[PDB]
Every structure is written in C-alpha cells, then in structure tokens.
Motif scaffolding. Structure first.
Motif, PDB file in Angstrom:
ATOM      1  N   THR B   3     -88.978  54.059 -35.527  1.00 20.84           N
ATOM      2  CA  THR B   3     -88.490  52.779 -34.683  1.00 20.84           C
ATOM      3  C   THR B   3     -87.392  52.938 -33.622  1.00 20.84           C
ATOM      4  O   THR B   3     -88.173  52.495 -32.705  1.00 20.84           O
ATOM      5  CB  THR B   3     -87.490  51.868 -35.889  1.00 20.84           C
ATOM      6  OG1 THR B   3     -88.013  51.719 -37.084  1.00 20.84           O
ATOM      7  CG2 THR B   3     -86.872  50.760 -35.391  1.00 20.84           C
ATOM      8  N   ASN B   4     -86.546  53.462 -33.708  1.00 19.20           N
ATOM      9  CA  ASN B   4     -85.752  53.735 -32.599  1.00 19.20           C
ATOM     10  C   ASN B   4     -85.315  55.328 -32.048  1.00 19.20           C
ATOM     11  O   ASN B   4     -84.632  55.501 -31.151  1.00 19.20           O
ATOM     12  CB  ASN B   4     -84.420  52.878 -32.317  1.00 19.20           C
ATOM     13  CG  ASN B   4     -83.550  52.980 -33.832  1.00 19.20           C
ATOM     14  OD1 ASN B   4     -83.874  53.937 -34.531  1.00 19.20           O
ATOM     15  ND2 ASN B   4     -82.644  52.262 -33.952  1.00 19.20           N
ATOM     16  N   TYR B   5     -86.082  56.025 -32.814  1.00 17.26           N
ATOM     17  CA  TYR B   5     -85.847  57.453 -32.549  1.00 17.26           C
ATOM     18  C   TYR B   5     -87.122  58.350 -32.908  1.00 17.26           C
ATOM     19  O   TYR B   5     -87.871  58.219 -33.530  1.00 17.26           O
ATOM     20  CB  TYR B   5     -84.665  58.217 -33.248  1.00 17.26           C
ATOM     21  CG  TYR B   5     -84.929  58.336 -34.744  1.00 17.26           C
ATOM     22  CD1 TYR B   5     -84.553  57.007 -35.641  1.00 17.26           C
ATOM     23  CD2 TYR B   5     -85.671  59.244 -35.374  1.00 17.26           C
ATOM     24  CE1 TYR B   5     -84.869  56.943 -36.908  1.00 17.26           C
ATOM     25  CE2 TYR B   5     -85.669  59.364 -36.642  1.00 17.26           C
ATOM     26  CZ  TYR B   5     -85.342  58.423 -37.586  1.00 17.26           C
ATOM     27  OH  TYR B   5     -85.870  58.250 -38.766  1.00 17.26           O
ATOM     28  N   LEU B   6     -87.105  59.512 -32.178  1.00 19.32           N
ATOM     29  CA  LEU B   6     -88.241  60.389 -32.176  1.00 19.32           C
ATOM     30  C   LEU B   6     -87.498  61.783 -32.458  1.00 19.32           C
ATOM     31  O   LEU B   6     -86.504  62.145 -31.336  1.00 19.32           O
ATOM     32  CB  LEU B   6     -89.134  60.590 -31.049  1.00 19.32           C
ATOM     33  CG  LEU B   6     -90.244  61.271 -31.289  1.00 19.32           C
ATOM     34  CD1 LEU B   6     -91.169  60.571 -32.240  1.00 19.32           C
ATOM     35  CD2 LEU B   6     -90.923  61.598 -30.026  1.00 19.32           C
ATOM     36  N   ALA B  84     -83.073  64.554 -31.230  1.00 21.64           N
ATOM     37  CA  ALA B  84     -83.429  63.206 -31.272  1.00 21.64           C
ATOM     38  C   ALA B  84     -83.482  62.588 -29.930  1.00 21.64           C
ATOM     39  O   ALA B  84     -82.446  62.693 -28.979  1.00 21.64           O
ATOM     40  CB  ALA B  84     -82.341  62.476 -32.061  1.00 21.64           C
ATOM     41  N   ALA B  85     -84.479  62.000 -29.549  1.00 24.29           N
ATOM     42  CA  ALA B  85     -84.484  60.972 -28.632  1.00 24.29           C
ATOM     43  C   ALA B  85     -84.269  59.755 -29.035  1.00 24.29           C
ATOM     44  O   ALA B  85     -84.849  59.241 -30.181  1.00 24.29           O
ATOM     45  CB  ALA B  85     -85.920  61.112 -28.023  1.00 24.29           C
ATOM     46  N   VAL B  86     -83.330  59.059 -28.624  1.00 26.34           N
ATOM     47  CA  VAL B  86     -82.790  57.673 -28.900  1.00 26.34           C
ATOM     48  C   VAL B  86     -82.848  56.471 -28.121  1.00 26.34           C
ATOM     49  O   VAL B  86     -82.644  56.434 -26.914  1.00 26.34           O
ATOM     50  CB  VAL B  86     -81.523  57.489 -29.543  1.00 26.34           C
ATOM     51  CG1 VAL B  86     -81.225  56.563 -30.195  1.00 26.34           C
ATOM     52  CG2 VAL B  86     -81.404  58.593 -30.637  1.00 26.34           C
ATOM     53  N   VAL B  87     -83.433  55.244 -28.567  1.00 26.68           N
ATOM     54  CA  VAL B  87     -83.294  54.259 -27.488  1.00 26.68           C
ATOM     55  C   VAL B  87     -82.033  53.303 -27.597  1.00 26.68           C
ATOM     56  O   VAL B  87     -81.905  52.452 -28.680  1.00 26.68           O
ATOM     57  CB  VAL B  87     -84.545  53.048 -27.822  1.00 26.68           C
ATOM     58  CG1 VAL B  87     -84.982  52.182 -26.767  1.00 26.68           C
ATOM     59  CG2 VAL B  87     -85.636  53.842 -28.625  1.00 26.68           C
ATOM     60  N   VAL B  95     -82.041  61.682 -24.720  1.00 27.49           N
ATOM     61  CA  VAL B  95     -82.257  62.925 -25.888  1.00 27.49           C
ATOM     62  C   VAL B  95     -81.017  63.559 -26.194  1.00 27.49           C
ATOM     63  O   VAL B  95     -80.132  64.152 -25.300  1.00 27.49           O
ATOM     64  CB  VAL B  95     -83.150  63.952 -24.937  1.00 27.49           C
ATOM     65  CG1 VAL B  95     -83.217  65.181 -25.926  1.00 27.49           C
ATOM     66  CG2 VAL B  95     -84.627  63.472 -24.763  1.00 27.49           C
ATOM     67  N   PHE B  96     -80.646  63.540 -27.369  1.00 26.39           N
ATOM     68  CA  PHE B  96     -79.366  64.210 -27.815  1.00 26.39           C
ATOM     69  C   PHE B  96     -79.694  65.359 -28.581  1.00 26.39           C
ATOM     70  O   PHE B  96     -80.883  65.419 -28.944  1.00 26.39           O
ATOM     71  CB  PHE B  96     -78.602  63.069 -29.195  1.00 26.39           C
ATOM     72  CG  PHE B  96     -77.833  62.020 -28.185  1.00 26.39           C
ATOM     73  CD1 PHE B  96     -76.836  61.725 -27.832  1.00 26.39           C
ATOM     74  CD2 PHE B  96     -78.863  60.568 -28.163  1.00 26.39           C
ATOM     75  CE1 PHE B  96     -76.201  60.676 -27.319  1.00 26.39           C
ATOM     76  CE2 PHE B  96     -78.150  59.454 -27.857  1.00 26.39           C
ATOM     77  CZ  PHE B  96     -77.070  59.583 -27.307  1.00 26.39           C
ATOM     78  N   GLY B  97     -79.032  66.196 -28.828  1.00 26.85           N
ATOM     79  CA  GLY B  97     -79.014  67.361 -29.600  1.00 26.85           C
ATOM     80  C   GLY B  97     -78.226  68.813 -28.909  1.00 26.85           C
ATOM     81  O   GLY B  97     -77.960  68.638 -27.594  1.00 26.85           O
ATOM     82  N   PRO B  98     -78.357  69.731 -29.527  1.00 27.97           N
ATOM     83  CA  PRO B  98     -78.733  70.061 -30.839  1.00 27.97           C
ATOM     84  C   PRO B  98     -77.771  69.243 -32.090  1.00 27.97           C
ATOM     85  O   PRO B  98     -76.784  68.840 -31.639  1.00 27.97           O
ATOM     86  CB  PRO B  98     -78.680  71.426 -31.314  1.00 27.97           C
ATOM     87  CG  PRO B  98     -77.311  71.680 -30.545  1.00 27.97           C
ATOM     88  CD  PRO B  98     -77.589  70.841 -29.281  1.00 27.97           C
ATOM     89  N   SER B  99     -78.456  69.225 -33.247  1.00 30.49           N
ATOM     90  CA  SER B  99     -77.910  68.694 -34.495  1.00 30.49           C
ATOM     91  C   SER B  99     -76.377  69.201 -34.468  1.00 30.49           C
ATOM     92  O   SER B  99     -76.315  70.743 -34.138  1.00 30.49           O
ATOM     93  CB  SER B  99     -78.748  69.173 -35.637  1.00 30.49           C
ATOM     94  OG  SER B  99     -77.876  69.545 -36.742  1.00 30.49           O
TER      95      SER B  99
END
Ligand SMILES: OC[C@H]1O[C@@H](O)[C@@H](O)[C@@H](O)[C@@H]1O
Ligand SMILES: OC[C@H]1O[C@@H](O)[C@@H](O)[C@@H](O)[C@@H]1O
Ligand SMILES: OC[C@H]1O[C@@H](O)[C@@H](O)[C@@H](O)[C@@H]1O
Ligand SMILES: OC[C@H]1O[C@@H](O)[C@@H](O)[C@@H](O)[C@@H]1O
Ligand SMILES: OC[C@H]1O[C@@H](O)[C@@H](O)[C@@H](O)[C@@H]1O
Lengths: 112, 109
Positions: B3-6, B84-87, B95-99
């Motif tokens: 939905t809003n992340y990859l 995570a790439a997030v909208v 693009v956020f990260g790393p965990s």
C-alpha cells in the motif's frame, strides 16, 4: 504537524489515549492505562507499563527513539534504540511486525 | 507490496503502486516510475517494457526492465540492513533504514 496514516508514525507524531497504528490484522495501541500494546499476531506485545502513569503518550523522536511519556514527561518506557540523528518512521507492517526504520537516506524532494 | 511501502527485497511490478492520499507512485507501462501529484519521475520512459521496482540490502531503489538491466538507481547508500521506501503524506517518496527496532507479536513475551 504531519497528516496521519494509519500504519505509520514519523518522527514527531504523538499517539495517546487509545490512538493506534492499524494494519491488516493488527493494531498497536497506546492505551489509556499507559500500556503500549500490539494486538493480534500469535502472541502480541505489551510494554506491560499498565497503570505506570497518567495521560501517557507515545512518540518516536529524531534519534530513532520511540518513547512513552506520562503527562509530566517522565519516561515510562523507551524503545532504547538511539542511533543517527535525522528523520525516522515506525511502520506497523502488514506481516505484524512493528518496525522502526531510519534515518532517511534518499528522497524525491525536500520537506518544506 | 503493501500500500504505502516497499520493504527492501520487495518488488513493485508493472501496474503496481504505492498510494498515500492524493499521491500515487505507479510503476508504469513504459518502464517510467511516475509519482503522480508529486512532480517526480524516474524519468525512464520507453527505456524498457515489463519493468520492476526493487529496494536493496543497502537502501537503494533500483529499476530493471523486462530483460534484466538496471535502468535507474537512486544512487543513495547506507549500511547492510532492512529498508522501507515509504510514501510520506506530504507527497515525497522516502527510503528509510536500516531497521533499528522490531516488535514481534509471534514469539512470546
Ligand atoms: O492539525 C494541526 C494542523 O494545523 C493546520 O492548520 C496546519 O498548520 C498543519 O500543518 C497542522 O498539522
Ligand atoms: O483489554 C485491554 C487490557 O488488557 C489487559 O490485559 C491489560 O494488560 C491492559 O493493558 C489493557 O487495558
Ligand atoms: O527537514 C526534514 C523534516 O522532515 C519533516 O518530516 C519533519 O521531521 C521535520 O522535523 C524535519 O526537519
Ligand atoms: O513529473 C511527472 C509528470 O509528467 C507529466 O508529463 C505527466 O505525466 C504528469 O502526470 C506527471 O506528473
Ligand atoms: O538518479 C539519481 C537522482 O536523479 C534525479 O535527477 C532524480 O531522477 C532523482 O529521482 C534521482 O534520485
């Protein structure tokens, strides 16, 4: 402020009073009893901080710390996971994992 | 896809999209990644057919065509980890990260 999206919590936003992340078959709820609880999964999660405080709220900061404060800003619970200073997010993922990703390393364009 | 992340390792396929509000990242026909209402594109139209959008172990967004070639990289790099790439609802793709933390409702308390 930042508009809400039921499954995300970016650095800055603040849930409290049974506010929640909602994903597929899960909810992570910052409850009224100062207990942060993920609902669903096989066992779920709590921080067990029930009754520990009044008017508690949850907030992921910009150092990667997701924290629970009571109305007097006493730490009740930390994700205890401080890292590099920047923009973070907390996704309640569709697979049930609440995961904090950050900091931000790439964008299509800048905030303001 | 969700939905809003990859998440890193996930693939956004032809016609696949990520939506947040009036915003829509479509992995389009012509191998062009367009973020509608977001004034942004990979800007790689016709540079492929049957293409796919991926996220690396290192937090880089990559697009390959139907054959197999990288066609756009985000060029940004960080350490080995989950991403995570997030909208974002402001209309940016981030693009956020790393965990840095995980809550697991499958293993017990
Ligand atoms: O919901 C509070 C909101 O107030 C609005 O008028 C704007 O300033 C937003 O940026 C802010 O989020
Ligand atoms: O029904 C929800 C309740 O679940 C109980 O077991 C408590 O641990 C509380 O955290 C919570 O208010
Ligand atoms: O400059 C990037 C900005 O991103 C926004 O979403 C907020 O996190 C701001 O606090 C931050 O400074
Ligand atoms: O930035 C990409 C833009 O390209 C334009 O030519 C159209 O395709 C728009 O719908 C899109 O927003
Ligand atoms: O390709 C590296 C960068 O180039 C810019 O012109 C845009 O295409 C960005 O989306 C991209 O991150």
């Amino acid at each position: 402020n930042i508009p809400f999206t039921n499954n995300l919590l970016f650095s800055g936003q603040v849930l409290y009073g049974d506010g929640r992340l909602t994903a597929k078959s899960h909810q992570l709820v910052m409850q009224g009893d100062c207990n942060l609880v993920l609902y669903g999964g096989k066992y779920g999660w709590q921080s067990n901080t029930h009754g520990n405080g009044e008017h508690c709220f949850l907030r992921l900061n910009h150092k990667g710390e997701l924290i629970i404060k009571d109305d007097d800003f006493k730490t009740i619970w930390s994700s205890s996971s401080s890292s590099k200073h920047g923009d973070y997010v907390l996704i309640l993922r569709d697979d049930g994992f609440a995961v904090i990703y950050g900091p931000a390393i790439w964008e299509t364009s800048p905030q303001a | 896809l969700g939905t809003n992340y990859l998440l890193s390792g996930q693939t956004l396929d032809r016609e696949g999209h990520l939506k947040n509000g009036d915003f829509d990242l479509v992995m389009q026909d012509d191998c062009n990644l367009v973020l509608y209402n977001g004034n942004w594109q990979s800007n790689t139209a016709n540079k492929g057919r049957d293409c796919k959008l991926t996220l690396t172990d290192y937090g880089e967004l990559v697009i390959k065509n139907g054959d197999g070639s990288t066609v756009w990289r985000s060029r940004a790099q960080s350490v080995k980890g989950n991403y995570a790439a997030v909208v974002h609802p402001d209309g940016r793709l981030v693009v956020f990260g790393p965990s840095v933390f995980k809550i697991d409702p499958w293993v017990p308390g």
